């Protein structure tokens, strides 16, 4: 079931595999027929949810339509056991983008620090997404740190009823480097090391 989930993730993320929607519908029907003669649906659902988290917390615009086909096939195959939670975390992603718009409007009204420019912050719930390991306690690069502070303040003043937690094992960023100005990309893992390098170069593992 894990390999089946990986295959369906590869077919659902990479649009090259299966160009015209004609051969896509047939291949999805064949995949669900193959899954019909399969046991241990729990691990399949768990890995499908993990793949959903991987594909929705990364670059979007993957299909913006095939998700409806996937959930419709799941409804006619699994039923109403875990599909409801799937559409619930999809609604969480809608809540995420609405709160991103809210933080944009907050930077528009205030935005004290320049760190809060185009903040693509997202808001999710602990129950839906498997983010129970949301406690990497690490330092944040000055400007992004100030941006996070501002966002927290705004969201709280808005619905004062949520305990926002800080984490690093999710998301991405665009690092503008500088003969031309080529913008790099850091997946919230290299931001602290690169910020320390900016503060002072010639560091090592001990530093």
């Amino acid at each position: 079931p894990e390999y089946l989930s990986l295959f369906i993730d590869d077919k659902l993320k990479k649009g090259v595999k299966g160009l015209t929607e004609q051969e896509v519908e047939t291949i999805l029907d064949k995949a669900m027929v193959l899954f019909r003669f399969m046991q241990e649906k729990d691990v399949f659902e768990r890995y499908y949810k993990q793949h959903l988290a991987r594909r929705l917390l990364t670059n979007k615009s993957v299909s913006d339509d095939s998700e409806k086909n996937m959930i419709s096939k799941l409804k006619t195959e699994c039923g109403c056991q875990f599909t409801s939670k799937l559409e619930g975390m999809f609604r969480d992603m809608s809540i995420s983008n609405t709160t991103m718009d809210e933080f944009r409007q907050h930077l528009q009204a205030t935005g004290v620090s320049l760190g809060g420019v185009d903040l693509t912050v997202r808001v999710l719930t602990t129950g839906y997404w498997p983010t129970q390991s949301a406690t990497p306690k690490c330092n944040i690069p000055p400007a992004p740190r100030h941006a996070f502070e501002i966002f927290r303040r705004f969201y709280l003043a808005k619905h004062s009823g949520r305990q926002l937690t800080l984490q690093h094992h999710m998301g991405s960023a665009d690092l503008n480097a500088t003969t031309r100005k080529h913008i790099l990309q850091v997946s919230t893992f290299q931001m602290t090391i690169l910020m320390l390098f900016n503060n002072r170069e010639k560091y090592t593992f001990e530093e």
Binding site: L57, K85, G88, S96, T99, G115, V117, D118, L119, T120, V121, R122, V123, L124, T125, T126, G127, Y128, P130, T131, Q132, A134, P141, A143, P144, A147, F148, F151, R152, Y155, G161, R162, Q163, L164, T165, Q167, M170, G171, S172, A173, D174, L175, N176, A177, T178, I183, L184, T188, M191, L194, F197, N198
Partner: protein, 89 residues
């Protein structure tokens, strides 16, 4: 500077009223047993008592919320109907 951050795409997590210091049902703690378990070892066989998480992001002991399912189950910290979305802290 040599490297300047332009965009940031963080994700924020949040919980409603979990009260780490106290189960809202049992008032002992989010962890460390419940009112009907008391001794940690006793006869538990790895302490089946875990933490139950609902769609309303409220956290209690699984034993704490299982006793409330019999009667009205409205997640007494709000008006949302209690579900079972996650097991274990």
């Amino acid at each position: 500077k040599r490297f300047e951050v332009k965009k940031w795409n963080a994700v924020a997590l949040w919980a409603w009223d979990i009260v780490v210091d106290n189960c809202a049902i049992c008032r002992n703690h989010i962890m460390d047993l419940c009112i009907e378990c008391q001794a940690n070892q006793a006869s538990a066989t790895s302490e089946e008592c875990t933490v139950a998480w609902g769609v309303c992001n409220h956290a209690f002991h699984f034993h704490c919320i299982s006793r409330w399912l019999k009667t009205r189950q409205v997640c007494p910290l709000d008006n949302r109907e209690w579900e079972f979305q996650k097991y274990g802290h």
